[PDB]
Point group: none
């Protein structure tokens, strides 16, 4: 909607904003927010307090009728310098359409995600400064990391249309610092870049790939013997185990945890998935860009979330979701060795998401964070309570997206599955000799990928930031 009012050059200009900000740029912290009253509409407030800010949660009237000054809207919004609205996507219009009137002049509005501004096309009072601070973590590891004296990497942005006194960045950086983001790393992006990539990631590989992949591997393991109790155990904690290597060294390291002959097959499966799934990944990115996605989901918002719930149904009534969990323990290496197709699905999904985004004007640095960086964290979720936990930790917009994709992906891959060879999923592939040349050329192609190169450079930064704990 708002994105669609821009032209190619203007969309591209915004679509490609994402710079890793230096440590010299945060030589102030939450300074610009010192003294000023900050009204949130926990994760962050708790952290910001320890930074020296005046946090105050403004709960709903009905809620505040049945350690911060938990007051209300009119009882806080007026003298508020920065209203950090963190309500669900489906209700931003209302919240913002009731909070603005109460907001004083020269105040700033705070967003966590840019769906309202960009997709819904919300109109904010020309004197209100609109900004955004979104930490890279599906859960609450932001507050946790804050305790360890460190923090999670975060993205900041300031809507051009609403930068009255030109103090958007000052507030943004201040807010980010208060959350500890400057400790890990802050990405100077934009509302448009954040929304398109975010939607792409979550529905295509961060959650979309993991749901379809879980319901495809489990179901397959069962069709091929395998004790469902044991199966479900592999699928539930697998993603997490292989993705932990992914977190430590990218796709490169993840592939190296396999035996050379295993790896090669994994690479082979990887390339085949990308061949099959490419069109779907594209369709998803294209619909996000054209605004066809947002438009469609919103139709469900006004239709009682029918689709969003109907899919909740089937999801909860799936073999995997409703299956016994093996009691015995499974070795770490066992999840790799037995999860060749899973590793292959990760590589293909990560690479395809990355590539599709970059082909749509999104900068690599940005695409990296939305197609690989958070993949681990979301995996940890399933490794706690199957898909259920995932579709609970993530927003409804994410879940809606995941279903939209996964319920299309699964069928698409039915034939492919019906062709798996022994060793692909379930039984391990024995280490052995392999063509020296093929091993060399394949190992190179992997670490040579655009996401492995930037992922390295980016992981290298976020590391030097953790070095500084003095």
């Amino acid at each position: 909607n708002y994105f669609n009012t821009l032209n190619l050059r203007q969309q591209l200009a915004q679509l490609g904003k994402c710079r890793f900000m230096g440590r010299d740029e945060f030589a102030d912290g939450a300074s610009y927010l010192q003294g000023k009253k900050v009204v949130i509409v926990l994760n962050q407030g708790l952290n910001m307090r320890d930074s020296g800010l005046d946090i105050s949660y403004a709960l709903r009237k009905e809620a505040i009728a049945e350690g911060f000054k938990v007051g209300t809207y009119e009882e806080l919004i007026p003298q508020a310098d920065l209203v950090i609205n963190l309500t669900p996507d489906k209700q931003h219009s209302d919240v913002v359409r009731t909070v603005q009137p109460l907001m004083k002049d020269g105040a700033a509005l705070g967003y966590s995600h840019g769906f309202n501004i960009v997709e819904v096309g919300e109109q904010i009072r020309k004197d209100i400064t609109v900004v955004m601070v979104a930490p890279k973590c599906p859960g609450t590891e932001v507050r946790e990391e804050y305790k360890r004296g460190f923090g999670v990497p975060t993205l900041i942005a300031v809507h051009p249309e609403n930068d009255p006194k030109g103090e958007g960045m000052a507030i943004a950086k201040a807010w980010a610092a208060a959350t500890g983001g400057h400790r890990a790393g802050v990405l100077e992006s934009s509302f448009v870049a954040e929304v398109k990539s975010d939607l792409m990631g979550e529905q295509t590989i961060l959650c979309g790939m993991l749901q379809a992949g879980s319901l495809l591997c489990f179901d397959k393991l069962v069709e091929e013997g395998t004790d469902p109790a044991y199966a479900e155990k592999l699928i539930q904690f697998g993603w997490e185990t292989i993705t932990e290597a992914l977190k430590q060294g990218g796709i490169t390291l993840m592939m190296d945890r396999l035996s050379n002959p295993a790896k090669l097959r994994a690479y082979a499966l990887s390339e085949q998935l990308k061949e099959i799934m490419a069109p779907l990944f594209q369709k998803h990115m294209d619909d996000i860009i054209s605004g066809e996605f947002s438009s469609g989901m919103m139709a469900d918002w006004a239709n009682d979330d029918k689709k969003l719930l109907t899919w909740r149904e089937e999801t909860g009534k799936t073999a995997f979701e409703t299956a016994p969990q093996y009691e015995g323990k499974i070795g770490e290496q066992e999840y790799f060795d037995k999860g060749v197709l899973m590793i292959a699905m990760v590589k293909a999904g990560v690479e395809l998401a990355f590539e599709t985004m970059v082909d749509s004007g999104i900068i690599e640095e940005s695409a990296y964070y939305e197609s690989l960086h958070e993949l681990p964290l979301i995996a940890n979720t399933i490794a706690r309570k199957r898909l259920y936990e995932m579709n609970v930790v993530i927003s409804d917009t994410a879940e809606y997206g995941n279903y939209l994709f996964s319920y299309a992906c699964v069928p698409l891959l039915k034939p492919f599955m019906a062709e798996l060879q022994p060793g692909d999923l379930g039984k391990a592939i024995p280490e052995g000799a392999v063509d020296n040349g093929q091993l060399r050329d394949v190992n190179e192609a992997i670490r040579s990928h655009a996401i492995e190169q930037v992922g390295k450079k980016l992981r290298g930064y976020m590391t030097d930031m953790k070095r500084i704990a003095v």
Copy 2:
């Protein structure tokens, strides 16, 4: 229209295609086209010229014209016959053609293609020099016809002059994806290109969309639009401030050529280096102020070009008997500069630089801005470089030959309309800017002297550090080697 039926991802894909090909990729020269019947439609300048080259290259070239042209002893008809070419009618040469090269003016493209297709056999190839008919008009070519493009990077006849010197002009080639049934696009495309001599100087593998958008932006912005605007703005200023008209017109007519020659040898960096330190810094300053003022107008043109608002607009004029094109042509021809007498005496090379500080700045400003705007619209640097700097020295040569009149005559009608569309906007835009020119900006040299070391250092780096200077150095290198192989 066609571009408009594409989504963000698809447009970007096309917009970004531009690879400098390897000399070895043309090992078969024009062989693929050997023994084939090549029919050229429209014997204009580029038409006749490409014909001569392709003939000298051993190809089978014959010109096809509307029966009326041949009947009326029209000029196109005489040009062909007087040049020992086989000239016939559409129904007489098209039916057995393997390659129909449409080199008629853009306005006529749709009509030409509408009568030539029916006569074209199955599997035959249709060639263009500009992708306007395909991208902007949306022309639908029969499914079995292969559509390709070969666009020599030169405004006039240098493509022939260079070929006679055993060399050539750098060229762009493309093959429309929707029309490559036998997958022989590139084969035909490379053959034709080599036939014109393009492989000797360098050939770029781009796309129809990338060629149309970048090419339109360049001509209506820095390649022609800026030169006209600048010539008029600068000449007038020169006279207003006292300079003798006859001497002022000489300064402008040959000024561009002299300073762009330096640009040719070494990009913006060298052009600026010809100036004295204090003069350089001022030029730098002026160009930055100029880029601030013109950025919106530059952007409007690029935006309108990307959105089809420009083609749509010009097509409106096509159907209006070229009213806007012709009225602007006539007006531009009545300008003081176009009629001003030319200085009798002589002007030294360095005088054009010293007395043309603003002209140098306009070139720098226009070049970077056009390049920048294009790259910001999804066009790849290589393309942007060729359409916002490479051909500038060539257009300047045209002006040094016969004022603006020559430029507008040499360039296509689409380029002429595009130029005017920008010119009649850019001149007013700069009125206030010109009103504040300081002494030395234009007309008089800035006394040589000391300059702050830090500033000269910072300005020298700002110059050669620019994206266009980087790419330029590289791309000029390639072309210099291809030319280097003149043995």
Copy 3:
């Protein structure tokens, strides 16, 4: 000694001369160049006799050589290590193919060739046609087909001698013995242990040939790779002073002098070591009848792999630290290692020491009889999986794996290697 008459600057000059020529510098080809009876009527002479009887040859060949004639070498040892003088009218050049055996011919017949080095002596190029002859000569051997390096007599000798007596042969011999005796000593049937060693090096270096150390290490399981890495380091740490000693004596000429002395002592040391070495268990051991899977040689040769990595790096490093060019060091501390491994698989150490020059052999022994003793305490503390058995394939520390992988492919020689191999791979594509 010539090299010794030069000063630090003049030495670093020669020592650092080595440029990988291009496809273009070989357009003419052998076109330029197209007993006492032939000696006089000769355009160019090609002395390929052993280093010991080199001075003599020239001392009888010069007199017969016409004026403006050219003299060619294959090892500047006689020019650099031996203060050999030649007529100022004689143009001295060199063309030495980077291959020990005879693949210099086997490859030519196939169409390709062996990457060869060429150089011209400073004070011996009056007509200034050194390169003309060298390029034409080398071209006639098929060198331009694989790649020819433009180095110098000094750069050639100094690095050539360090390579053969260190990683190319010295490490191979000492490694074989140390490893064979250790296997047997730990139980392993001597007939089996014998095949492992004889053919192990060849199998291992094959990967090394295709993708340098990186690929060699990649053939091992992660846990085995990590162990091979550690063993590699420990190893370099210990052999360090020895490689340095060898490189240093080759620079100072303490080596060339020591061996030229044994030339007067009727190759005493050279033959005492040639014999003593044949009495070794490995040289005189029964060969397993059964078979050993390609992958077994890797999984059961961890310490063997470590010796190669360590040896190649340390040799490469020590050469660069003495003023030798990277690419120059690559072709003398890794490129030829595979070719020599083949020799050992063909006929144990006997074959190797027989193929390599007498100088090469002498050097090998000088290192072996020193290295072997040095590693005894090391070997004594080995662990299961390190040699003979196979470290079971399992999980490893993501971080440690990742760091080691990068540590391995980040080494200088691995960088140059990937590049140089690429060059040669494309020089071969041109056919």
Copy 4:
């Protein structure tokens, strides 16, 4: 002596040590010395500077003077005490002292330590500011004594001046391997360097050998030797060609400083950039000719510095009562340039450039040739830079203050000897070159005007593509960051 005891490999090892350290590598600063006895043997300009610096840094500093020097309150006594510095004798200070900084002239170095060691406790450290003692003389220090070094990259007293400004001077620290028992060398050296504020500009982790060998080369060539030979040669030339002696004396006295300042801001690149194009072209050509002629001489110097031929020869003179050093000093002071009257009128900044074409070229030739010759001898580009360009501006400031007299009086005797050693050979060497200068090379400006585009482009690249220019921009970039930290 010592350096000669090492072999090719071993030499190159030490010879190639010199890496720029990270800002945070000095988090502790000089806290490793806070609470220890810091004694400084011998007091002079250099000494007092550092002491006063480490003083404010917070370190117990004392000055151990000779027996007589305390009885008749000599210069050293005065300078120290007057500043409120704790003074004493060797017998009452050296013992129970953690760090004994030997800041005395090289000529007396051996003897100084040959009396200080015995009194030094166990585990005590012996610092330096030049390794001529260690490297050039077989000075044997107690196996238990740690030998470190901290030599600031400034000939004058800016090490103290810049410290008072809250900044510092890039310093080069090192540690003799043969004397690092408790392996605390780097810990101390690092602290010492921080105590002089050196970490505020940039601290280079090098070695005793790299320092000596490079430090000596630069001073006797480009850094000083060239400046003296250049001054004399040009002054005599300017006068011989008709420039008023008083004006010529001023052109030379203040030219090196002016030209060299631009050098300080942007390396050879910016320096050349201050000249007019035709002038830049000529300076460039003169630079090449000058390097071809002086190559053997620069080489000889570097070579003798390595072979020990230099240190050997100078030490000989030490015993001969400094015969040569004094004779040359006397001769120099009688040169026309040193006694000539200084023009009273003002000379514009740009004039020093324009009329100093040859001076600029001499700096280019000398700088590159020195750098080139050092690198060709195993010295790292990083180390070659600081000793063949970084300090040139500072030495030029000296001459501008009091002709060559001041230069020679500021630099050490070893430096002065090296200078004369080179000068009195360079001057006769360039006599025939000077006889061939063309109009404009010296004393008169070369009028701006046209120049071949390609040529100017080429020269421009050649200039900024030189090795020293590369490392230069890199290093100067680092030092500028440490500088930009004015927070």
